[PDB]
Enzyme design. Structure first.
Site, mmCIF file in Angstrom:
data_model
loop_
_atom_site.group_PDB
_atom_site.id
_atom_site.type_symbol
_atom_site.label_atom_id
_atom_site.label_comp_id
_atom_site.label_asym_id
_atom_site.label_seq_id
_atom_site.Cartn_x
_atom_site.Cartn_y
_atom_site.Cartn_z
ATOM 1 N N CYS A 1 17.970 47.965 -40.570
ATOM 2 C CA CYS A 1 17.248 46.755 -41.192
ATOM 3 C C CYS A 1 16.687 47.190 -42.686
ATOM 4 C CB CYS A 1 15.749 46.714 -40.343
ATOM 5 S SG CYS A 1 14.495 47.967 -40.213
ATOM 6 N N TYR A 2 16.758 48.369 -43.143
ATOM 7 C CA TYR A 2 16.411 48.646 -44.397
ATOM 8 C C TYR A 2 17.306 48.379 -45.660
ATOM 9 C CZ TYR A 2 12.278 50.951 -42.059
ATOM 10 O OH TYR A 2 11.147 51.160 -41.398
ATOM 11 N N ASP B 1 18.372 53.595 -41.178
ATOM 12 C CA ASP B 1 17.987 52.466 -40.140
ATOM 13 C C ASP B 1 18.606 51.013 -40.876
ATOM 14 O OD1 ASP B 1 17.007 50.190 -38.904
ATOM 15 O OD2 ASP B 1 14.937 50.994 -38.711
ATOM 16 N N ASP C 1 19.522 49.266 -35.287
ATOM 17 C CA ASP C 1 18.737 50.184 -36.379
ATOM 18 C C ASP C 1 19.794 51.095 -36.447
ATOM 19 O OD1 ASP C 1 17.518 52.498 -36.809
ATOM 20 O OD2 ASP C 1 16.134 52.337 -35.285
ATOM 21 N N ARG D 1 11.481 55.407 -45.404
ATOM 22 C CA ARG D 1 10.693 56.151 -46.201
ATOM 23 C C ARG D 1 10.856 57.679 -46.348
ATOM 24 N NH1 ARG D 1 5.336 56.684 -41.856
ATOM 25 N NH2 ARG D 1 6.761 55.703 -40.137
ATOM 26 N N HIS E 1 6.744 52.600 -48.431
ATOM 27 C CA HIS E 1 7.491 52.177 -47.277
ATOM 28 C C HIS E 1 8.640 50.955 -47.740
ATOM 29 C CE1 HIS E 1 8.445 51.505 -42.809
ATOM 30 N NE2 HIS E 1 8.768 50.572 -43.549
ATOM 31 N N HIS F 1 16.757 43.206 -36.296
ATOM 32 C CA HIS F 1 17.822 44.200 -36.875
ATOM 33 C C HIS F 1 19.187 43.314 -37.247
ATOM 34 C CE1 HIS F 1 15.364 47.476 -35.522
ATOM 35 N NE2 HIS F 1 15.537 47.880 -36.725
ATOM 36 N N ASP G 1 19.086 43.869 -31.704
ATOM 37 C CA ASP G 1 17.888 42.921 -31.274
ATOM 38 C C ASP G 1 18.133 41.968 -32.646
ATOM 39 O OD1 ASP G 1 16.280 43.650 -33.581
ATOM 40 O OD2 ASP G 1 15.941 45.395 -32.505
ATOM 41 N N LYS H 1 12.277 60.493 -43.480
ATOM 42 C CA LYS H 1 12.405 59.568 -42.161
ATOM 43 C C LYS H 1 14.103 59.202 -42.065
ATOM 44 C CE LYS H 1 8.962 58.004 -40.179
ATOM 45 N NZ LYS H 1 9.741 57.697 -38.961
HETATM 46 C C1 JAN Z 1 9.445 49.984 -38.864
HETATM 47 N N1 JAN Z 1 10.427 49.255 -38.185
HETATM 48 C C2 JAN Z 1 11.628 49.514 -38.662
HETATM 49 N N2 JAN Z 1 12.689 48.892 -37.962
HETATM 50 C C3 JAN Z 1 11.855 48.233 -36.823
HETATM 51 C C4 JAN Z 1 10.638 48.238 -37.202
HETATM 52 C C5 JAN Z 1 9.448 47.680 -36.335
HETATM 53 N N3 JAN Z 1 8.563 48.889 -35.708
HETATM 54 C C6 JAN Z 1 8.669 46.921 -37.375
HETATM 55 C C7 JAN Z 1 7.173 46.499 -36.838
HETATM 56 C C8 JAN Z 1 6.341 45.599 -37.592
HETATM 57 C C9 JAN Z 1 7.125 44.981 -38.612
HETATM 58 CL CL1 JAN Z 1 6.165 43.778 -39.635
HETATM 59 C C10 JAN Z 1 8.514 45.118 -38.859
HETATM 60 C C11 JAN Z 1 9.051 46.230 -38.032
HETATM 61 C C12 JAN Z 1 10.087 46.938 -35.289
HETATM 62 C C13 JAN Z 1 11.077 47.461 -34.121
HETATM 63 C C14 JAN Z 1 11.593 47.022 -33.407
HETATM 64 C C15 JAN Z 1 11.483 45.454 -33.235
HETATM 65 C C16 JAN Z 1 10.624 44.823 -34.121
HETATM 66 C C17 JAN Z 1 9.831 45.796 -35.215
HETATM 67 C C18 JAN Z 1 10.370 43.613 -34.112
HETATM 68 C C19 JAN Z 1 9.691 42.698 -34.900
HETATM 69 C C20 JAN Z 1 8.524 41.874 -34.186
HETATM 70 C C21 JAN Z 1 7.654 40.876 -34.951
HETATM 71 C C22 JAN Z 1 7.828 41.153 -36.492
HETATM 72 C C23 JAN Z 1 8.845 41.520 -36.967
HETATM 73 CL CL2 JAN Z 1 9.318 41.794 -38.763
HETATM 74 C C24 JAN Z 1 9.767 42.697 -36.134
HETATM 75 C C25 JAN Z 1 11.097 42.800 -33.017
HETATM 76 C C26 JAN Z 1 12.060 43.491 -32.253
HETATM 77 O O1 JAN Z 1 12.509 42.730 -31.295
HETATM 78 N N4 JAN Z 1 12.233 44.699 -32.074
HETATM 79 C C27 JAN Z 1 13.042 45.600 -31.371
HETATM 80 C C1 FII Z 2 6.850 40.500 -41.961
HETATM 81 C C2 FII Z 2 7.322 41.544 -43.013
HETATM 82 C C3 FII Z 2 8.021 41.145 -44.539
HETATM 83 C C4 FII Z 2 7.190 42.985 -42.700
HETATM 84 C C5 FII Z 2 7.641 43.927 -43.333
HETATM 85 C C6 FII Z 2 8.964 44.662 -42.868
HETATM 86 C C7 FII Z 2 8.438 46.080 -42.488
HETATM 87 C C8 FII Z 2 9.479 47.153 -42.499
HETATM 88 C C9 FII Z 2 7.094 46.417 -42.354
HETATM 89 C C10 FII Z 2 6.730 47.844 -41.823
HETATM 90 C C11 FII Z 2 6.374 48.114 -40.621
HETATM 91 C C12 FII Z 2 5.993 49.491 -40.274
HETATM 92 C C13 FII Z 2 5.730 50.576 -41.531
HETATM 93 C C14 FII Z 2 6.192 50.050 -39.007
HETATM 94 C C15 FII Z 2 5.974 51.149 -38.566
HETATM 95 O O1 FII Z 2 7.081 51.799 -37.991
HETATM 96 N N1 FII Z 2 7.547 52.870 -38.559
HETATM 97 C C16 FII Z 2 8.111 53.877 -37.989
HETATM 98 O O2 FII Z 2 8.137 54.178 -36.824
HETATM 99 C C17 FII Z 2 8.698 54.942 -39.042
HETATM 100 P P1 FII Z 2 10.047 54.180 -40.261
HETATM 101 O O3 FII Z 2 9.154 53.838 -41.113
HETATM 102 O O4 FII Z 2 10.941 55.457 -40.647
HETATM 103 O O5 FII Z 2 10.691 52.838 -39.494
HETATM 104 ZN ZN ZN Z 3 14.673 48.763 -38.356
#
Ligand code: JAN
Ligand code: FII
Ligand code: ZN
Ligand code: 3FX
Ligand code: 3FX
Ligand code: 3FX
Lengths: 315, 485
Positions: free
Chosen positions: B312-313, B310, B366, B304, B253, B376, B373, B307
């Site tokens: 953030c990647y 997005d 995204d 990944r 991932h 992102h 947000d 999928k």
């Molecule tokens: C997997 N993903 C891809 N884009 C967003 C996400 C995620 N599902 C996510 C979940 C956990 C972590 Cl450690 C990182 C990313 C996600 C999606 C939406 C999110 C947030 C996080 C987060 C968020 C919240 C806490 C920590 C982190 Cl790193 C991210 C905040 C927020 O406002 N929004 C809308």
């Molecule tokens: C605090 C830090 C450095 C966190 C790592 C940032 C990320 C991207 C962590 C992974 C979180 C994760 C795998 C969430 C699961 O959500 N994923 C999906 O819904 C599918 P996709 O992988 O395509 O976003």
């Molecule tokens: Zn994202």
């Protein structure tokens, strides 16, 4: 209307403690009356380290409002163990959380802690719970990681039988039949067939696996999941690419390709990658360079720089 | 500059082929392809001089993004309670994005940031997701708070850096409480074990001069076993009973690959014998570049295989590219140049697809269809920075750093938890300090390597790989804790 906790007979002995942000904090959140009140009392409860039923009830109130509140989850699990609460009841509560769309990572980690502490002689029912939860949400990353943990943990305890491993592969095969592009299920297959310590490795095992991989490619030639698995497989077992090349060569223009299925434009870039790597295996670097050049300039132009880098490696 | 980085507008857009086998994955993909390509069709090619009449202008809307971050800055609506345990991330996403966007905070506002974050610091060690009277310490807000203090703080009595320095021993003891025998760390008391924790801890330990042999034992092994057959890294590895074998516990991932590459990179600075255990750098580089989406999906990164792309990647995957590239470079040198990903296409995804539609809230997102947000916004911009600016880890810069280091200057050594857990002696400790500091300051922007798609008004500041703060923040901050100022 809401009844403040300062007015509840059950909480009269408790002096709430206010959130200490200091003066003029940045990123302040506008809290509901209910959430502020619950947290003011949690601060008091946690400060005095009270392990009681009312504290347990309070942690449920809070995590229902904020499922990601890791501190409150940590306190909740401390409460469950101090009070010697029924952990099976708690799992039932986590089940109820999912039904009510109260999902968060913390819910799943809490399940893990519960499974670890209950330490059932047979974890089949949790395996089935995980399967059921994946059906409507088939790529949930943390659910797949939890499944890996469950099998890994319980197998080190000697608690996964051969029948159980067998039924798991059947389930995984079905997930990939339903969606062959599900990379999460490919990752699980890898654990089941390759990486787990109890996996069988024999000539017939490798044979069977190769058959499954090639068949998958022939079914969906543009499926990156199947290509990456092929490449990972050959690399892991130090198997040469050349003897399999006849199965791949038609995509560059043991199970062989189908007339190809409709909507299969050629070449498939990862088939070209396979071809180039096989030339390198043969020390035919000029021929490999030529393929990398084509990937770079024509067939996979998004990665023009990477394929040029691979090309330069040859010359 | 751009021979091997074609514009999305210069390439043929075609859907991912079906092979006549429908699936849920493909239905979602096709739908996303339609959404992204339609936005590109409505938007003027950022590379054009004849900036098209009738079409949306893709220029980076810095002022809208600034307004987006401001309004989140000083009062957040009730719906943000879902992030009440992530307030330091809210701070970091805001202050780092403002740095990238070139927008200064006044001193009064910076002081509020510092004071807010200091109230999140526990005397026993570490920052939590909110006030120390409300939340326990956690590795992730410890990273976010430390970085935000680098961004908003200073060396004065009210600058916060002084408090961090006084907190070194307690933070260290918190890190050691988190440590597991197999080399993993729990993120907090009773918490999950994963490589995000490892990453956040290693960044902080590097910055604050609190690295010891006992802190690092097995940490390389845990990270290395996270690598999957795909070449990226999963969240964790499982140790079978020190361990007889370690096995990755999920898919490769973007988020975990970033954390694993960066963690591994931080460990390569540390002079322990046969340390760190190697990773497969070629495979990680391959996995990285393979996540860049096709022209029809705008050249954004997915997180990944199979999928969706997005924004953030752009940071998690695009920002791991310079790290993977450097590790590959070193491996090749130990046996014995065009961009490694499409730096132009990634910028086009950011400008065209990842920005909120104009004249609205601002912020980045995204993908089209999703609300922007703070998370992102920060990560799109961090990835944009990596694409605009060619980042290298420079051996001659590291050599210059070694030459100027003053080992006679420093904060007091950490007291190890176990009697023999520290460095063998002062020669070894000082050598370690030198290597770790010198390599942390080894990232450079290559001269003539800049590519600003759409013209110079789109230029943002240069973030640092591995750390993700501006070099102009990183340098005085790490110099403060190593007394190198
Ligand atoms: C997997 N993903 C891809 N884009 C967003 C996400 C995620 N599902 C996510 C979940 C956990 C972590 Cl450690 C990182 C990313 C996600 C999606 C939406 C999110 C947030 C996080 C987060 C968020 C919240 C806490 C920590 C982190 Cl790193 C991210 C905040 C927020 O406002 N929004 C809308
Ligand atoms: C605090 C830090 C450095 C966190 C790592 C940032 C990320 C991207 C962590 C992974 C979180 C994760 C795998 C969430 C699961 O959500 N994923 C999906 O819904 C599918 P996709 O992988 O395509 O976003
Ligand atoms: Zn994202
Ligand atoms: O973030 S940006 O898009 O660059 C800034 C906004 O477009 C502001 N546009 C103003 C509208 C009124 C005339 C002066 C300019
Ligand atoms: O001395 S320290 O332990 O660092 C400072 C305080 O005790 C922190 N304890 C909080 C109480 C309420 C719940 C979250 C923790
Ligand atoms: O510096 S250069 O790259 O040659 C050209 C400028 O940056 C162009 N920026 C535009 C100016 C007019 C408003 C929209 C942005």
């Amino acid at each position: 209307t809401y009844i403040p906790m300062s007015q509840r007979r059950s909480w009269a002995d408790v002096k709430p403690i206010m959130q200490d942000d200091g003066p003029n904090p940045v990123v302040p959140i506008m809290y509901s009356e209910e959430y502020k009140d619950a947290m003011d009392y949690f601060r008091a409860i946690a400060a005095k380290e009270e392990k009681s039923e009312r504290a347990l009830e309070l942690t449920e109130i809070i995590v229902r409002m904020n499922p990601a509140h890791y501190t409150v989850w940590q306190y909740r699990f401390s409460l469950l163990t101090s009070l010697n609460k029924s952990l099976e009841d708690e799992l039932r509560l986590m089940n109820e959380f999912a039904v009510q769309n109260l999902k968060s990572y913390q819910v799943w980690h809490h399940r893990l802690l519960l499974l670890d502490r209950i330490s059932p002689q047979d974890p089949v029912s949790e395996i089935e719970y995980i399967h059921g939860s994946l059906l409507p949400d088939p790529k949930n990353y943390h659910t797949w990681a939890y499944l890996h943990w469950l099998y890994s943990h319980f197998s080190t305890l000697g608690r996964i039988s051969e029948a159980q491993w067998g039924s798991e592969l059947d389930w995984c095969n079905e997930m990939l039949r339903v969606d062959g592009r599900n990379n999460s299920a490919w990752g699980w297959r890898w654990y089941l067939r390759v990486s787990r310590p109890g996996a069988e490795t024999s000539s017939r095992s490798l044979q069977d696996e190769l058959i499954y991989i090639l068949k998958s490619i022939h079914l969906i030639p543009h499926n990156v999941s199947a290509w990456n698995y092929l490449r990972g497989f050959l690399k892991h077992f130090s198997l040469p690419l050349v003897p399999i090349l006849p199965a791949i060569l038609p995509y560059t223009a043991f199970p062989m390709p189908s007339p190809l299925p409709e909507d299969t434009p050629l070449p498939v870039p990862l088939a070209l990658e396979y071809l180039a790597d096989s030339f390198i295996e043969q020390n035919r670097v000029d021929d490999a360079a030529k393929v990398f050049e084509k990937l770079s300039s024509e067939y996979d132009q998004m990665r023009a720089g990477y394929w040029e880098f691979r090309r330069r490696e040859c010359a | 500059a751009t021979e091997f980085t074609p514009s999305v507008y210069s390439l043929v857009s075609k859907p991912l082929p079906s092979n006549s086998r429908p699936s849920a994955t493909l239905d979602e993909q096709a739908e996303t392809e339609d959404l992204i390509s339609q936005l590109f069709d409505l938007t003027a090619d950022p590379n054009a001089l004849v900036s098209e009449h009738g079409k949306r202008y893709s220029g980076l809307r810095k002022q809208e993004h600034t307004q987006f971050l401001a309004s989140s800055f000083f009062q957040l609506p009730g719906k943000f309670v879902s992030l009440d345990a992530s307030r330091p991330w809210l701070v970091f996403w805001t202050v780092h994005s403002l740095d990238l966007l070139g927008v200064a905070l006044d001193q009064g506002t910076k002081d509020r940031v510092v004071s807010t974050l200091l109230h999140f610091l526990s005397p026993k060690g570490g920052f939590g997701g909110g006030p120390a009277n409300s939340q326990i310490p956690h590795l992730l807000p410890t990273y976010a708070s430390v970085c935000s203090l680098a961004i908003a703080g200073n060396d004065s009595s009210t600058g916060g850096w002084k408090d961090l320095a006084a907190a070194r021993q307690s933070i260290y003891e918190f890190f050691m409480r988190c440590k597991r025998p197999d080399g993993g760390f729990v993120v907090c008391e009773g918490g999950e074990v994963d490589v995000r924790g490892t990453y956040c801890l290693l960044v902080v330990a590097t910055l604050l001069d609190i690295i010891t042999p006992e802190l690092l034992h097995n940490v390389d092994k845990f990270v290395s076993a996270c690598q999957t057959y795909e070449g990226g890294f999963a969240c964790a590895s499982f140790p079978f009973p020190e361990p007889s074998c370690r096995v990755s516990m999920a898919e490769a991932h973007g988020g975990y690959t970033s954390c694993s590459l960066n963690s591994h990179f931080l460990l390569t600075s540390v002079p322990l014998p046969s340390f760190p255990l190697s990773i497969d750098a070629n495979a990680a580089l391959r996995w990285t570049v393979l996540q860049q989406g096709e022209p029809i999906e705008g050249g954004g990164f997915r997180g990944r295989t199979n999928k969706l792309v997005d924004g953030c990647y752009s940071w998690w995957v695009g920002g791991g590219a310079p790290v993977a590239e450097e590790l590959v470079r070193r491996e090749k040198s130990r046996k014995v140049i065009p961009p490694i990903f499409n730096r132009v296409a990634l910028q086009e995804f950011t400008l065209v697809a990842a920005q909120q539609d104009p004249g609205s809230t601002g912020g980045l997102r995204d993908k089209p269809g999703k609300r922007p947000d703070q998370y992102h916004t920060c990560n799109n911009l961090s990835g944009l920075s990596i694409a605009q600016h060619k980042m290298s880890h420079s051996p001659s810069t590291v050599s210059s750093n070694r030459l100027k280091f003053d080992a006679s200057k420093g904060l007091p050594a950490v007291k190890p938890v176990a009697p023999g857990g520290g460095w063998k002696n002062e020669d070894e400790r000082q050598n370690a300090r030198r290597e770790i500091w010198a390599n942390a300051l080894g990232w450079i922007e290559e001269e003539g390597g800049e590519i600003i798609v759409g013209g110079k008004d789109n230029r943002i500041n240069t973030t640092t790989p591995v750390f993700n703060i501006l070099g102009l923040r990183l340098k005085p901050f790490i110099n403060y804790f190593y007394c190198q100022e």
